[PDB]
Amino acid sequence: APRSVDWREKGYVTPVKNQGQCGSCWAFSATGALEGQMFRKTGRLISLSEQNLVDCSGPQGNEGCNGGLMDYAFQYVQDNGGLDSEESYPYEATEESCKYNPKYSVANDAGFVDIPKQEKALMKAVATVGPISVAIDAGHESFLFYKEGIYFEPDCSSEDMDHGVLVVGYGFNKYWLVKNSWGEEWGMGGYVKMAKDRRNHCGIASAASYPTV
Numbered sequence: 001a002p003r004s005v006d007w008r009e010k011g012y013v014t015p016v017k018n019q020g021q022c023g024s025c026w027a028f029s030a031t032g033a034l035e036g037q038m039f040r041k042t043g044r045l046i047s048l049s050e051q052n053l054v055d056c057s058g059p060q061g062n063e064g065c066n067g068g069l070m071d072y073a074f075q076y077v078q079d080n081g082g083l084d085s086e087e088s089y090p091y092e093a094t095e096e097s098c099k100y101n102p103k104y105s106v107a108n109d110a111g112f113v114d115i116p117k118q119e120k121a122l123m124k125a126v127a128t129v130g131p132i133s134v135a136i137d138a139g140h141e142s143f144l145f146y147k148e149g150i151y152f153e154p155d156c157s158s159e160d161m162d163h164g165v166l167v168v169g170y171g172f173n174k175y176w177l178v179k180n181s182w183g184e185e186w187g188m189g190g191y192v193k194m195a196k197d198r199r200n201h202c203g204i205a206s207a208a209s210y211p212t213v
């Protein structure tokens with residue numbers, strides 16, 4: 001693992017998206033992690049369908065706009081044998097019936113991995129595998145109103161994490177490079193430098209995973 005990683009400079013990452021008012025952060029988180037692992041194996045970056053996850057991942061456990069888990073999404077992809085592109089299956093910030101069509105699938109996986117709960121373990125996964133799906137405690141107006149700098153909230157938890165995002169790299173005092181799903185208008189062009197190697201700040205390590213590809 002090096003001193004800094006930016007997986008964006010290497011093709012693994014698509015633009016920042018906006019979840020609307022739907023509470024789907026787990027679909028975005030999970031399509032981003034699948035995005036860069038699909039890039040890894042195939043060398044083509046393709047936008048994936050967050051709506052497909054929202055309408056269809058119920059059987060695995062996700063409650064659409066009421067909530068979900070990244071882990072359950074990858075597990076949908078596995079069980080169902082695919083995900084659709086965003087071309088074919090566009091995002092409507094709304095829960096509806098499943099309109100999956102294999103004739104338009106472009107990603108798949110054989111399950112997921114749960115990274116041990118350590119920041120040293122998180123660093124190394126990011127360093128070797130790609131961007132990783134994580135879950136942090138956004139539950140503060142501080143995070144909501146973040147514009148720029150090394151985000152560090154004095155009263156942030158390490159145990160409960162309410163919001164699933166994407167670690168696309170890290171840098172250097174030191175920071176995790178985090179892609180959110182609240183549009184490019186939020187924070188730093190949609191990204192937020194989260195504090196790194198500080199008693200598991202905002203639980204970023206606590207629940208990191210990625211799709212087996």
Ligand SMILES: *C(=N)CNC(=O)[C@H](Cc1cccc(-c2nnc(C=N)o2)c1)NC(=O)c1cc(C(C)(C)C)nn1C
Binds near residue numbers: 023134135
């Ligand atoms: C986003 N706008 C709304 N947030 C959620 O839906 C969160 C995201 C989240 C938080 C904490 C962990 C995870 C996650 N994903 N994989 C893993 C474990 N390796 O952890 C995702 N969702 C929840 O808080 C949530 C959803 C549920 C279900 C669907 C099981 C009821 N339970 N929780 C706690």
